[PDB]
Specification:
- The structure is cut from a larger assembly and holds 6 copies of chain A (172 residues).
- In chain A, 76% of the residues lie in helices and 0% in strands.
- Chain A is mainly α.
- The first copy, chain A, has a single domain, classed as Ferritin (Up-down Bundle).
- The first copy, chain A, is elongated.
- Chain B binds chain E through residues 1-4, 7, 69-71, 115, 118-121, 123-125, and chain E through 97, 104, 107-109, 111-112, 115, 127, 130-131, 133-134, 137-138, 141, 144-145, 148-149, 151.
- The complex binds fe (iii) ion (14 copies).
- Residues 56, 59, 103, 133, 136 of chain D line the site of one fe (iii) ion.
- Chains A, B, C, D, E, F: It holds the Pfam family Ferritin.
- Chains A, B, C, D, E, F: It is found in: Cytoplasm.
Chain lengths: 172, 172, 172, 172, 172, 172
């Protein structure tokens, strides 16, 4: 039987499929970062990062749904193993903030290509994703700011972790 | 600062980490099977398999939580690209049922090792997982049975897909 | 059309089918014991034993459902006629307690074989059945204890029967 | 101690005891037919026949209650192994309908004997049973009619099974 | 008058009675640890450990009930005065965590023997106890992790005690 | 760091700590007596004595709280195993009543010493304990009176146990 062709252009298909794989990779990285925190007495950051990992996977699913609805084949590639070696809480959040900046940039690129191609169905679709990503980037900036304000001397790590614990709990 | 050692034995830790990666692999395979269905006018099976993919990831998360609570580092490996080319609905569900049999066997292996190790905290933890996996395996057996009963003649594909659509909607 | 093979091993199939037939036999025995009590002015024990008979049949049904769901043929054999000759209330409950001990042993055997075969779907399934059987065995032990404490002199049979009547009513 | 004699005549007692054993036999036959369906991808008929088997046992219990209340010893015989090999859905429902005709006739015989004996307590007691059996006989007539109308061609079996599934679910 | 024999095997009886006594002794140890904290300005840990002592006695009672229901004589042994001298908060929780590990191991031993014995009534009964003990062990690991993370420099002891206080209150 | 001295006098401390241990001893004694009843078909007395044992431990806990709040070290001592061999229901309740008289006497002694010491915080605190112990002593007098009224003979033991069972349940 005949099924309708993909409803999106080849370039937009490529960018969206790449994005699904970025979000899956991201999810694995945050699970790894979360585990590091949990195994180093930082269960506040552990919880926060675990919940954030699950959220990135929710983004991958929503992108997959959009590809499905447009009759676009989902192309899952090999998801490379995430980094597991970390130095401490500050380095984890520095790496995470830089990672969120890269994710924001990748989304801005898809949205820009949608504009150039005149694919306004995709432009309109991606708006929740732009908004939620901006909120996540700001969140990591704020937590990093706080970790650096507190510092790691004289029970600072505990204070930072409790601070993050409070954020994690308020968000669920 | 000193954090407590992993609370589980090395063998149990390795099997559980392997199981996490099994469920992630599973989730990707089912997303790919789902996509195939969606792009071949089988949105009932597409939905069913998408929701099943998501459920497998939920199992991975639950295993991760148990690892975190026991101070066990989570070791996420590379996730390999899933199969993406399929012959049809029957082949997909034959493959899927065979896959679910393998998953069931893999869980039985962990539970067996927990008994042999006298790790009854892990034995007890795994009971929800044994139960839910059994229900999933029976489900795939039932769907495969139905696809085979209906046949692909005439509008058999439509009929099988609608039947799977009904199951997908009922399980939400 | 092709239907999937039985999902359980041959040994577990045999033990489970035998158990369905044990529970059906048990149900008939309790109906017979119940009738003896009713026709000898012991309507308390009559009711209790009737309700217990119906419960054993409910166990047979739940086992049948599990066999059905695993695509395992239910093999009902000839159910031999139950004993009908009884000496009195004490002998009925002595026989019944010994019978419940045999039923408990038979269930422990299936669960042990599930462990040996690594069939943890069946092990997990049987847990309600282990729990409910233990409660029933304890119940018969308690009633037997009470019948022997009261004794059969000077309206003791009436007191024992009213005691059992109270238990029967509280359980429904 | 002296207990009152059976409150019913010998002929009525024998017919009622025979009817109890008829319903137990019936229940087993239907469990076996149900199993056949479940193991041949007909879970709609499997469910319908399982629930019907259970209902026949409920009739046996109700007859037992009446016997107990009249101080009539219940005589449970050996229950013979039911037929387990069947040709298909149509043959099962042909056999089942014929079986229900025989059950209806057997009840008519008891009611007739009650009239001839002037046993109007038994006549009156049996009215729920006459009524419910008539509804059961009509049901099997209707299902057989539908199976024959649909046919087994193409996906006829699927269609008939789904129709029976709908009836099974509606009767709960 | 004759009472029924104990319903459990001699080895299971010995292990269960030993466990009752272990829980009683645990309650004493925790009361003593609690008192140390209350008398050294650590009312957070004081409260936590008092409430935990009380919960160990609740375990002893649940074990006693199971022995009673099986007609197994409870054999309470002599109590030896618990340790009353401690060095500080950290040492108390190090000792406590080590104690909880010993308790977990002792339960795993009973569960293992129940398996080897084919005593699945006992296996099944112990499952709440396995699950609750694992939760207690994890809790003591978490608290010790937090105590080590905070330190006793500056007002570290205050912060750690306040942390434990919050946990004690949240568990009520 | 400096913690405040005990707020009670040395003599009052000694008597209160001895009292904690008396209550602990009572708990054990009543658990043992309870077990004897349960293994000799007297589940009414079994339940009554078990619940009483638990209530004695509640008294110990309440005394412990008062010591803690006053910065008084809890001094839990070695206690002999409780008696495990008994002659029968009457002898158990005679021993128990005698025991309750001794406990009452021990409380009166502390209250007396509080008056003499002008320790009215302690006098005031103990009033619930005086009141509850008086009720318990009266209760054991009433049960013993009833046991002696009923007698051992001609199902008297059963009647006495059912009577105690009613009290056990009414007290919740
Ligand atoms: Fe993000
Ligand atoms: Fe994102
Ligand atoms: Fe699965
Ligand atoms: Fe799974
Ligand atoms: Fe039973
Ligand atoms: Fe049973
Ligand atoms: Fe019928
Ligand atoms: Fe009928
Ligand atoms: Fe059709
Ligand atoms: Fe514990
Ligand atoms: Fe414990
Ligand atoms: Fe008292
Ligand atoms: Fe007292
Ligand atoms: Fe009397």
């Amino acid at each position: 039987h005949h099924s309708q062709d993909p409803m999106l252009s080849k370039d937009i298909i490529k960018l969206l499929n790449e994005q699904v794989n970025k979000e899956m990779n991201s999810s694995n990285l945050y699970m790894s970062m979360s585990s590091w925190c949990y195994t180093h007495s930082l269960d506040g950051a552990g919880l926060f990062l675990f919940d954030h990992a699950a959220e990135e996977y929710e983004h991958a699913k929503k992108l997959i749904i959009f590809l499905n609805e447009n009759n676009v084949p989902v192309q899952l590639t090999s998801i490379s193993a995430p980094e597991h070696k970390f130095e401490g809480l500050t380095q984890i959040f520095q790496k995470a903030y830089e990672h969120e900046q890269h994710i924001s940039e990748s989304i801005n690129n898809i949205v820009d290509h949608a504009i150039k191609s005149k694919d306004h169905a995709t432009f309109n679709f991606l708006q929740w994703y732009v908004a939620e990503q901006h909120e996540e980037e700001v969140l990591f900036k704020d937590i990093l700011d706080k970790i650096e304000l507190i510092g790691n001397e004289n029970h600072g790590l505990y204070l930072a972790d409790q601070y993050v614990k409070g954020i994690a709990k308020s968000r669920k």
